Amino acid sequence: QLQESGGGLVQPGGSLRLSCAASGKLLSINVMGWYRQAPGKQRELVASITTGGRINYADSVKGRFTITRDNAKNTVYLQMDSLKPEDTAVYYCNADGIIAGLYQNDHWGQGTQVTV
Amino acid sequence: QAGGSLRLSCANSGLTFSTYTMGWFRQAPGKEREFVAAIRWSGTSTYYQDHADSVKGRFTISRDNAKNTVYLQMNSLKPEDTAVYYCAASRLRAGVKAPSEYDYWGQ
Amino acid sequence: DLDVIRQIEQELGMQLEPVDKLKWYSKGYKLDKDQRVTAIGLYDCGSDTLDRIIQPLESLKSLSELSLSSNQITDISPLASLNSLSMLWLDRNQITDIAPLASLNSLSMLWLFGNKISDIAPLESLKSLTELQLSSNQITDIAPLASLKSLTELSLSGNNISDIAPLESLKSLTELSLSSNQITDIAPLASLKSLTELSLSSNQISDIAPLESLKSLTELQLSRNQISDIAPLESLKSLTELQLSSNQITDIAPLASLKSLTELQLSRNQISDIAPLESLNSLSKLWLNGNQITDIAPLASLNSLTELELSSNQITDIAPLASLKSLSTLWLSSNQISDIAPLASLESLSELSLSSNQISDISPLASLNSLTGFDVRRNPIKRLPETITGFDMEILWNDFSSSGFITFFDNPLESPPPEIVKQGKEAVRQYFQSIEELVHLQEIKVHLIGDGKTSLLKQLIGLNVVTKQAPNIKGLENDDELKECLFHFWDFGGQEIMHASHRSSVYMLLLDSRTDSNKHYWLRHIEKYGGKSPVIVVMNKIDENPSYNIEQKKINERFPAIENRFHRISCESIAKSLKSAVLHPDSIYGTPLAPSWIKVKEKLVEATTAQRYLNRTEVEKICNDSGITDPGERKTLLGYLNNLGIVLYFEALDLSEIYVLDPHWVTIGVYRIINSSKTKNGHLNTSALGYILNTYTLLEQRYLLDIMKQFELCYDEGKGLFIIPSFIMKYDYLPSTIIPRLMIAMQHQILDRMQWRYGMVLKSQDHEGALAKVVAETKDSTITIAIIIWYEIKKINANFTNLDVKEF
Ligand SMILES: Nc1nc2c(ncn2[C@@H]2O[C@H](COP(=O)(O)OP(=O)(O)OP(O)(O)=S)[C@@H](O)[C@H]2O)c(=O)[nH]1
């Protein structure tokens, strides 16, 4: 499972650092990243990073959000700056990997509210 | 435009209220903060409710407790009566109709 | 050869690096004694890598490890001539056919999960395999793995596998992943004994018969199934983790035989009692949400717990949860808990879910400073406690359960407004600090000034002094602005009736067409006496002369207390004029004074409505009942009591028996004696005031006698005689009582009882002999002198403020 730390209410133009740690059960992580849900909208990718070092951005938060990863301790950090009020959403963690020998390309977190 | 209408709203939130009277003062060219219309409204009640010069009909004053606001209605506006309006709050509870006690200037 | 490695490097444009023991995400190579390539990793090299590298790959015959994981390849036909391999990574590609994987006689490790394979026949000749990853595929049968011995780790999970019987032929395995499939019978998994981890997740399994045979298992994942009996698991006590999520189970006693279990997810079942979880002291995580359980007391002996999920259960009393101290998460929402006192000792908590319960008081959860999540949605909370804003969290009104947040939804928040609590923590704090952090009078008097009065009494539906409220007045009850306003109406009228003293009032002057000649009189009376009160001039009886209108502009500019408040009605704009006149700075209707002043005023009214005359001692006693003894403060209180006409007070009484006095009797008393048809003749009897009047007695008789001599209205002469006097000198607004004040000198020049009631005759008793007579003419507002007198006239008119006089 993925545990997320962060979120809250930030004034516009502020900053945030959403952390996401994968439990020791999750074994072989290739792609790990961040998604969002706005009220009355659909899930959409924010950022994805791979074990090799390939970054995929949403083309709407390009040059705005930064994704960083530690592979030793399987952790992703979303550093978010200059948060326009269209980002008032609930952010979710996406990962691919193996728990108890089973592989799914979509392991989700609980979600955390970011308000502006 | 000349002789038109203009409703100005001035809102105050979380203050003395009961120990506060709201007065509108018009002074563009350093007119020494001339008194226009004040109101010591307490809920539905209203105590002071007085005007000056242009008087009533010309200038209308009201207060709504639903959103704690005071409304100044400008009608038959004379063009030479060009001035900027400020909100002032009076707090003293000794002597009604206290002009000099409008210390807490508004926005 | 490093030449081959460089060839691959420029073909792919990727910096292959001399590395160590190969991994699935490796992108380099491994050398040997005499620098021979043995292991090569191509991680994410594009979809066209395999068809472009096979010639260099076959060029060197020492390769034994290949990593092409996550390359998204579709054809693996080139992977045929590299017969020297030992390990092959092919994860996460669009591979459908594995037929080329037939000539690789030597292979010990094969990773293929992220693929699209459907037929595993070709890897039937792979003899010495030890690791197979085949999860998340489209396979439906596993025959060919039967010939595959020496397998230790097998992952066939995420497919359409229904038969599993050939796995019986495989007996060397250690980890078996068999999940997200369509499996019903696990009978083959009996002869296995070396297995340690078993993942039999989502499936249609309901009879775990052969698992008793297994004994070395440490991880057992059995969730989203249709199992009901867990007695088979009672024998085995070696499992560090056994997950039994969504299922239909009612008994957990067989679990009580386990003691080394660490994490237990027991969710969405029909388990009734959790007492068997009374001996598992090593439990670190417990998930018991969504069940029909009642009592948590048996869980009061698992002090090693760190995570507790008890949500959506039928628990009401939380008290036998105070023993646990090392708890970090506590989800017990959607329950019937009432008070949260026996949690104040949970110093280590970091996330709470207390929503959808019947909780009213939140105050006890105050010392839990370590909380990083608290969720109390859908509860009947009435008041927000101080400590609710003492937590390191921000506040949200949303329906989402988010960590690091104080959350409310669907709560009857009465004292704190829901808008205030949805604004934020800072707004809650400012609202509460404002909650942590005078009284007006609302009275006025109206004297009707005639020369009519009944016509304005028709608007009331009275010999002065009548009380009314906003509903009483017709035409002014529409405005709720002045709903709680008292109105006092006084009115008189006559020729010789003259009571100047019976702001803080409103005077409606009354006019009639025949009396317009005497109009300056009462207007100047209002200007001089009374106060600076607003004045409303009204002309009545316009029906007899519908063409008469006064020049209201001239009198309005002459009298600055009018400000164009006029009416021309006969028997309404009167209500509008009255309202616009009451709320004036020059009048007192809303005046802020201390509430102690209004208590003192009420006590004074209570004393004066019966006593009718206070003593100075009693006045001071009542004033100091509230501690007020400042002469200025008491003077202002009495002035506000007098100018509003409830309790009168004059500065010229000079009597110690009476300090203040009641207008309801002390003014009507002067009214009776001032005219009783015995004073009309001009002289009042010795002491026949009882014949005049008659609560009134002889003591009050001589009280009022002293009062009327003190008001400078008459003189007692001798033997019980009484005057009641009610060159060319002209006065505008001829004062009505100037002859009563000029006739007080009775023991002075007087001929013999010669008084007109508008004049008098004088006979000088001083040196020599002079005969004098002074007489008044109301119709001309003049005074005549026949021949000290001028000195007395000036001494009497001195009691006026800018009263114009004319001498001729
Ligand atoms: N029927 C009728 N009589 C009227 C009306 N208006 C005035 N009157 C008469 O006028 C008389 C009273 O005159 P009024 O102007 O009230 O003098 P007053 O108030 O008594 O005396 P004052 O010195 O205080 S002004 C009454 O006898 C009344 O009958 C009216 O509208 N209808």
Author numbering:
A (entry chain C): 3 to 118
B (entry chain B): 13 to 119
C (entry chain A): 3 to 439, 447 to 460, 464 to 473, 486 to 526, 532 to 600, 607 to 729, 747 to 778, 798 to 858, ...
List sentences from the manuscript.
The Roco proteins are a family of large multidomain GTPases, with representatives in all domains of life. The minimal domain arrangement that characterizes this family consists of a Roc (Ras of complex proteins) domain bearing the GTPase activity, followed by a COR (C-terminal of Roc) domain that can be further subdivided into a CORA and a CORB domain. The first important structural insights into the functioning of the Roc-COR domains and the associated GTPase activity came from work with a Roco protein from the bacterium Chlorobaculum tepidum (CtRoco). Bacterial Roco proteins are simpler, only consisting of the core LRR-Roc-COR domains, and hence lack the kinase domain.
Here we use single-particle cryo-EM to solve the structure of full-length CtRoco in its GTP state, stabilized by the binding of NbRoco1 and NbRoco2. The cryo-electron microscopy (cryo-EM) map of GTPγS-bound full-length CtRoco in complex with NbRoco1 and NbRoco2 at 7.7 Å resolution shows an elongated monomeric arrangement (bottom left). A composite map, obtained by superposing the individual cryo-EM maps focused on the C-terminal (3.9 Å) and N-terminal (3.6 Å) part of the protein, was generated (bottom right). In the GTPγS-bound structure, the LRR rotates away from the Roc-COR domains by about 135°. The hinge point for this large movement is the linker region between the LRR and Roc domains, and in particular the so-called α0-helix that precedes the actual Roc domain. However, upon GTPγS binding this helix detaches and becomes entirely solvent exposed, as such disrupting the interaction between the LRR and Roc-COR domains. No density can be assigned to a peptide region linking the LRR domain to the Roc domain, in agreement with the flexible nature of this linker. Taken together, the GTPγS-bound CtRoco-NbRoco1-NbRoco2 structure clearly shows the protein in a monomeric and elongated ‘open’ conformation, allowing us to interpret the GTP-driven conformational changes, as well as the binding sites and the mechanism of allosteric activation of NbRoco1 and NbRoco2. We also find that NbRoco1 and NbRoco2 cooperate in shifting the CtRoco dimer–monomer equilibrium toward the activated monomer, since binding of NbRoco2 to nucleotide-free CtRoco allows the subsequent binding of NbRoco1.
